[PDB]
């Protein structure tokens with residue numbers, strides 16, 4: 404597993420988005436991983452629909468949260484539409500998958516990373532972008548604007564994001580705040596603290612899709 408991984412370099416991550424005033428972090432998280440995995444297999448980099456997860460994941464709660472695992476669970480069964488064809492509106496509405504033609508993509512299943520093990524998280528990110536959670540409500544986090552982030556922060560995770568890289572000292576994360584946040588929309592969180600939870604509770608719950 405190399406000392407460095409950055410999926411952006413191998414053209415596996417799309418531009419950073421802004422979730423706005425809706426708690427659809429869980430959907431944005433899920434989409435980073437789908438978009439990653441499809442490009443890893445097919446060589447194509449496509450933009451996929453956050454809005455659709457938002458509208459169709461019964462099991463989550465639209466704006467004001469849900470679960471990326473649930474979310475990844477739906478593309479495996481059904482599929483997902485391109486972001487062009489099912490645009491983000493930042494409001495939950497009816498599920499219109501149907502109205503929009505055949506799926507653009509389908510995934511083959513979902514897997515969870517062994518929790519509270521840096522090693523296991525690092526291994527997965529070596530293979531493809533992964534869905535992860537952390538505690539984002541503290542003001543140090545919100546105020547971040549470039550930097551190796553070591554907190555302060557607690558372990559009460561409340562915000563799903565995606566890990567798209569790592570270094571000797573950090574894990575790379577794509578946030579769903581604008582491009583105006585942290586590092587052009589990214590955050591480098593310090594690793595190897597040797598805390599099992601991870602900084603801000605980073606190792607609490609990670610998932611990635613499986614495809615052919």
Ligand SMILES: *[C@@H](C(=O)O)[C@H](O)C(=O)N[C@@H](CC(C)C)C(=O)NCCC(C)C
Pocket residue numbers: 422425426427428429467468469470559560561562563
């Ligand atoms: C993340 C975002 O800021 O959009 C979003 O609020 C979210 O999904 N939050 C939740 C995680 C899922 C359980 C919904 C949420 O529940 N908030 C508290 C998280 C844990 C229960 C502490």
